[PDB]
Amino acid sequence: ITGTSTVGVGRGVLGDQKNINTTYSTYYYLQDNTRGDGIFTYDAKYRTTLPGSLWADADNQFFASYDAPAVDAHYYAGVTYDYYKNVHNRLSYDGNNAAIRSSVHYSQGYNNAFWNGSEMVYGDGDGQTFIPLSGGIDVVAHELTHAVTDYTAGLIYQNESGAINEAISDIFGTLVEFYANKNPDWEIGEDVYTPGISGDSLRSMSDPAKYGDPDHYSKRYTGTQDNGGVHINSGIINKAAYLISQGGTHYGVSVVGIGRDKLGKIFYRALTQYLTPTSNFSQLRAAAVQSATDLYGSTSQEVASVKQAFDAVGVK
Numbered sequence: 001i002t003g004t005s006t007v008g009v010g011r012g013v014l015g016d017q018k019n020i021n022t023t024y025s026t027y028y029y030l031q032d033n034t035r036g037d038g039i040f041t042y043d044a045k046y047r048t049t050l051p052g053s054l055w056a057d058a059d060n061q062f063f064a065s066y067d068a069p070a071v072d073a074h075y076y077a078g079v080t081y082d083y084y085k086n087v088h089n090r091l092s093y094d095g096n097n098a099a100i101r102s103s104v105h106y107s108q109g110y111n112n113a114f115w116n117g118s119e120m121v122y123g124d125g126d127g128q129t130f131i132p133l134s135g136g137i138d139v140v141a142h143e144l145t146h147a148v149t150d151y152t153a154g155l156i157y158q159n160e161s162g163a164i165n166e167a168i169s170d171i172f173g174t175l176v177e178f179y180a181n182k183n184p185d186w187e188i189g190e191d192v193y194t195p196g197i198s199g200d201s202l203r204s205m206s207d208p209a210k211y212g213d214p215d216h217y218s219k220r221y222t223g224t225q226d227n228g229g230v231h232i233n234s235g236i237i238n239k240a241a242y243l244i245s246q247g248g249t250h251y252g253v254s255v256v257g258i259g260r261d262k263l264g265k266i267f268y269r270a271l272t273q274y275l276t277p278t279s280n281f282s283q284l285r286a287a288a289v290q291s292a293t294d295l296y297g298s299t300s301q302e303v304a305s306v307k308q309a310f311d312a313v314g315v316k
């Protein structure tokens with residue numbers, strides 16, 4: 001929409017008040033003109049037709065419960081855009097400031113969020129397994145990272161390349177969470193998962209096995225469910241990423257952590273420079289070692305830690 005850029009105020013899914021960038025033209029629209037070609041948030045109105053209607057509001061105040069998921073999807077997409085620009089110097093997901101679109105209130109009681117190759121989509125959850133998925137910053141960053149992956153490595157969504165695709169989204173979703181410093185952790189989806197149970201999360205990077213996911217290649221899922229276990233085998237890569245950053249001893253193998261920043265640097269480089277659509281776990285290890293070498297030298301501790309981390313999770 002063509003209008004005047006302004007700032008509205010609202011309350012997110014978790015009840016927190018935040019300011020959002022909107023556009024004015026008769027109505028106030030969830031259209032942020034301050035980032036690239038814009039950030040647009042749509043109302044799917046509980047249906048499955050996409051993208052739906054560009055979110056319109058009469059007074060620039062978003063405190064209605066219906067508004068909550070829109071506020072967060074819009075706000076978190078901005079934070080995620082900032083992370084990629086400021087930290088990795090990438091302009092939007094395509095690297096050329098492509099408009100970012102998200103639709104909320106997708107379907108009825110839909111327990112998921114996703115990147116469909118064109119935009120992000122968020123369900124409201126059934127109120128038990130999940131509350132509106134855009135309420136979690138690691139969720140929003142996870143979905144937008146899929147867009148980055150689409151325009152770079154293009155990791156096919158199945159088997160090992162799919163598990164890598166998923167892990168990259170969990171890894172960058174977590175780095176964005178730390179970046180915004182929103183009660184950061186190495187857990188995935190803790191803010192929107194199971195509103196009745198506290199202290200749990202959908203997945204864990206620090207300890208994947210906590211929620212039944214493999215933390216070692218010998219324990220990888222080899223079946224056909226979940227596109228060959230993309231949300232299962234990602235635990236192996238998530239564990240490796242956690243080890244590279246924080247360090248620790250896993251299955252007797254010791255890893256000296258090099259921190260989050262270098263983790264982000266190494267993985268972003270591997271993703272955009274070395275990974276291809278069919279890359280498997282072994283190739284990711286080679287990509288990660290190569291990236292750390294490019295950035296820090298072959299005799300660097302950074303290269304050493306990447307090797308130990310993959311050794312620790314059994315990926316040769």
Ligand SMILES: O=C(O)[C@H](Cc1ccc(O)cc1)NC(=O)[C@H](Cc1ccccc1)NC(=O)[C@@H](S)Cc1ccccc1
Pocket residue numbers: 111112113114115129136138139142143146173188189190202231
């Ligand atoms: O496995 C998934 O798809 C789970 C959803 C799930 C999990 C358990 C459950 O009982 C029901 C639904 N989705 C995801 O992990 C994340 C959402 C999320 C991220 C971070 C934190 C929390 C949630 N979504 C995905 O991975 C999307 S990208 C998977 C997908 C692809 C294509 C079409 C539809 C869905």
Ligand SMILES: [Ca+2]
Pocket residue numbers: 057058059060061062063
């Ligand atoms: Ca309003």
Ligand SMILES: [Ca+2]
Pocket residue numbers: 177182183184185190191
């Ligand atoms: Ca958190």
Ligand SMILES: [Ca+2]
Pocket residue numbers: 138174177184185186187188189190
């Ligand atoms: Ca988290």
Ligand SMILES: [Ca+2]
Pocket residue numbers: 190192193194195196197198199200201
């Ligand atoms: Ca919970």
Ligand SMILES: [Zn+2]
Pocket residue numbers: 142143146166169
């Ligand atoms: Zn995903």
